[PDB]
Write a protein that binds this ligand. Structure first.
Ligand SMILES: COc1ccccc1CC(=O)N1C[C@]2(C(N)=O)CC[C@H]1C2
Ligand SMILES: [Zn+2]
Length: 140
């Protein structure tokens, strides 16, 4: 589990969104595994606006933050999961790192701010849903 709290937005994995998230929906995209809902309180996270390919992510299944090198956002085939069938997920970045299904929502960050959240993994890989192209998260 986990979310990004920027301005009056909450960014979560679409497959972990709550009823309150759907009832206060701003934007969702199943191909990216992302959903954004509105919040009453202002958040403290800042979004990175950069081309970094190195950063640090939080792994709840180890209670640890790990440094990682990650690929550029791309269209990748992801195996079946109970939340989605085997399909192509867009704006996904891969890295070598430990991940388990419940690690979804952990933040990946660089020196500029939040880059994305854990969305996929298995066998020593971890995948992150990028959010750096969502410029509207910085306004309204
Ligand atoms: C955290 O992902 C891990 C980790 C270890 C093993 C397997 C996975 C992958 C996994 O179960 N999923 C990838 C999902 C997707 N984004 O389509 C999101 C949750 C389902 C579907
Ligand atoms: Zn950066």
């Amino acid at each position: 589990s986990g979310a990004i709290y920027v301005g009056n937005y909450r960014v979560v994995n679409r497959h972990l969104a709550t009823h309150n998230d759907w009832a206060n929906l701003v934007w969702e995209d199943s191909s990216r595994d992302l959903l954004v809902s509105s919040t009453t309180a202002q958040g403290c996270d800042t979004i990175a606006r950069c081309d970094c390919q190195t950063g640090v992510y939080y792994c709840s299944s180890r209670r640890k933050h790990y440094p990682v090198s990650f690929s550029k956002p791309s269209l990748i085939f992801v195996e079946a999961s109970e939340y989605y069938p085997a399909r192509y997920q867009s704006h996904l970045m891969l890295a070598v790192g430990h991940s388990e299904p419940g690690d979804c929502g952990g933040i990946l960050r660089c020196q500029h701010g939040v880059v994305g959240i854990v969305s996929t993994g298995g066998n020593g890989l971890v995948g992150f849903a990028d959010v750096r192209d969502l410029l509207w998260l910085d306004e309204e």
